[model samples]
Target: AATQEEIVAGLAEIVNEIAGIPVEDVKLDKSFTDDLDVDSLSMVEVVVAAEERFDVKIPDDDVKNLKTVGDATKYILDHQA
Candidate 1:
């Protein structure tokens, strides 16, 4: 399983790819929509990329639950079976 730091680094890349945001701007406590300023449709793209990168499934229901970078990192770390 990957550590939170690893997950954060990977997630930063995904966010950059999906939303064109800089990796440096992505912090663990930052919000996807509020901090990154990524729209809902862009967030969907980020989730899809993260799901593929982490080799985990994030359903529509759970997607909304992952609001912050830390939330997604924790979920990925806990579920990276």
Candidate 2:
């Protein structure tokens, strides 16, 4: 099971890799689209990468709630390890 901080870090790394941005630039409070410049395709890629990395399945219905790194961290902590 990954700790909260580890999960957040993992998420940041994934975002950086997929978005072609530096990991240091991904703030937990930043919005994916507004702050990270992630488009619709990148947004989906983030979700897919997160799901695979965590070995968990995020339902389509809950995808809308994941608007920021904090949001994704919370969801993973609440629903997965």
Candidate 3:
């Protein structure tokens, strides 16, 4: 299993690479939509990258629950469901 920092670092890279979001901007409190201004397509790309990098499956229904980087970090670490 990957550490949280590793997952977060990879996620930061993907967010930046796919959406042009800065690594500095992807924080625990930042929201993807409100804070990062992430559009629908970018969100999908980012999430897809995250799924592959983290080696996890994130259902579309679950994406709405990831409001912040913290939320995603927690969820990916917490469960596969």
Cα lDDT, all candidates = 0.75, 0.67, 0.70
Candidate 2 error regions (>4 Å): 59-61
lDDT for 26 (candidate 3): 74
Residues 1-81 of candidate 3 have per-residue lDDT tens digits of 555666566667777877677878777677767787655467687678778767776654687898777787788777532
Across 1-81, the per-residue lDDT of candidate 2 in tens digits comes to: 555676667767766777654566666686666677766466567667778777655653475787776676777777774
Give the residue spans of candidate 1 off by over 4 A.
none
Candidate with maximal lDDT? 1
> Least lDDT summed over 10 consecutive residues: which range in candidate 1?
37-46
Give the per-residue Cα lDDT of candidate 1 at 21.
64
Tens-digit lDDT string for candidate 1 (9-68): 777787687776667877778777788765656667766777787787675468678888
Residue 17 Cα positional deviation in candidate 2, in Å, after optimal superposition? 2.2
Error of model 3, residue 73, in angstroms: 0.8
Query: What C-alpha lDDT, on a 0 to 100 scale, does residue 66 get in candidate 2?
Result: 71
**Which residue pairs collide in model 3, if any?**
none
**lDDT value for candidate 1?**
0.75
Candidate 1 similarity to native, TM-score:
0.83
Model 3 backbone overlap count: 0
Clashing pairs in 1: none
